[PDB]
């Protein structure tokens, strides 16, 4: 009928930075109605190895290099030197 | 080992579509090939003053609020052979993921299982004629890597996604 | 026409630095980085 994929989620305050190799801590929430509605537009995967060209291929979620996030939008572009 | 104590403030982070235009004596060349696939000699192409409305969303394993493929699901990687390299996937249709600070994110079961078989219709083998495609979840590593981490309403969410990547197809 | 593009950039390195510098001005924490 209306089967939805419920994913357990957690709000952390101490995080490993994505900018550079660091750690950061933010204040706890103040709002009691944090609400987001995003549109999955993609996926960033990775494949299991040691089974090259064989019958199965395992693919797991990935991410981490935020560059790979800009790359998905900028792929079709390029800067050429103009006179 | 630099520690910095700033007046940690409760602000609200909002994404402003960023347009990137031509930098100095350079020119931006947009490839118009509806299904341009990464590296290669783009046939249909043209100069532009600025790219397009790019929404800088920081998050893991799931690209959100961005550009979709206008034709079919297109994947891209530097080397589809080296298992160590990230494979980006551009989706055909958008999927929704509604989340709240109350600890959960729900996404339509049907909508997402469909995109999975679509992505499955072309994995590593390279749109391979056929073989078994398996979706498992993260092997391990940082919380931001092992879970769909993102900044929702200013707060940092770490959504457990074992349920999105745990299935088998052919 | 008939040009070349790839898994390199345009604004990948640029944008990355704009966004890193955008986050800094916005979401301020209490940082800790290792030199």
Curated annotation (Swiss-Prot), chain A:
Glycan attachment positions: 39, 54
Q: Where in the cell is it found?
A: Virion membrane; Host cell membrane; Host endosome membrane
Topological category with respect to the lipid bilayer: Peripheral membrane protein; Single-pass type I membrane protein
**V5 as annotated region, ranges:** 52-62, 54-62
- Could you tell me what this protein does? Attaches the virus to the host lymphoid cell by binding to the primary receptor CD4. This interaction induces a structural rearrangement creating a high affinity binding site for a chemokine coreceptor like CXCR4 and/or CCR5. Acts as a ligand for CD209/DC-SIGN and CLEC4M/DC-SIGNR, which are respectively found on dendritic cells (DCs), and on endothelial cells of liver sinusoids and lymph node sinuses. These interactions allow capture of viral particles at mucosal surfaces by these cells and subsequent transmission to permissive cells.
Oligomer and partners: The mature envelope protein (Env) consists of a homotrimer of non-covalently associated gp120-gp41 heterodimers. The resulting complex protrudes from the virus surface as a spike. There seems to be as few as 10 spikes on the average virion. Interacts with host CD4, CCR5 and CXCR4. Gp120 also interacts with the C-type lectins CD209/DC-SIGN and CLEC4M/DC-SIGNR (collectively referred to as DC-SIGN(R)). Gp120 and gp41 interact with GalCer.
Q: What is this protein called?
A: Surface protein gp120
Query: Which gene is the coding source of this polypeptide chain?
Result: env
Covered residues of the complete protein?
410 to 492 of 856
């Amino acid at each position: 009928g209306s089967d939805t994929i419920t994913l357990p989620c957690r709000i952390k305050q101490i995080i490993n930075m994505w900018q550079k190799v660091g750690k950061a801590m933010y204040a706890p929430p103040i709002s009691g109605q944090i609400r987001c509605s995003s549109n999955i537009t993609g996926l960033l995967l990775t494949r299991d190895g040691g089974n090259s060209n064989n019958e199965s291929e395992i693919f797991r979620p990935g991410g981490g290099d935020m560059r790979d996030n800009w790359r998905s939008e900028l792929y079709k572009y390029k800067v050429v030197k103009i006179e | 080992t630099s520690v910095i104590t700033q007046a940690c403030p409760k602000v609200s982070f909002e994404p402003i579509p960023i347009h990137y235009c031509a930098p100095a004596g350079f020119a931006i060349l947009k490839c118009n090939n509806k299904t341009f696939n990464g590296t290669g000699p783009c046939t249909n192409v043209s100069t532009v003053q600025c790219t397009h409305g790019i929404r800088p969303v920081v998050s893991t394993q799931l690209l959100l609020n961005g550009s979709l493929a206008e034709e079919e699901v297109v994947i891209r990687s530097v080397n589809f052979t080296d298992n160590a390299k990230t494979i980006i996937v551009q989706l055909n249709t958008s999927v929704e993921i509604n989340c709240t600070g109350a600890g959960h994110c729900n996404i339509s079961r049907a909508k997402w299982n469909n995109t999975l078989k679509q992505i499955a219709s072309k994995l590593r083998e390279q749109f391979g004629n056929n073989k078994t495609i398996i979706f498992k979840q993260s092997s391990g590593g940082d919380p931001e890597i092992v879970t769909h981490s993102f900044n929702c309403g200013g707060e940092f969410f770490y959504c457990n996604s074992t349920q999105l990547f745990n299935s088998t197809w052919f | 026409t008939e040009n070349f593009n790839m898994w390199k950039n345009d604004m990948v390195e640029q944008m990355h630095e704009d966004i890193i510098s955008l986050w800094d001005q916005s979401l301020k924490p209490c940082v800790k980085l290792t030199p």
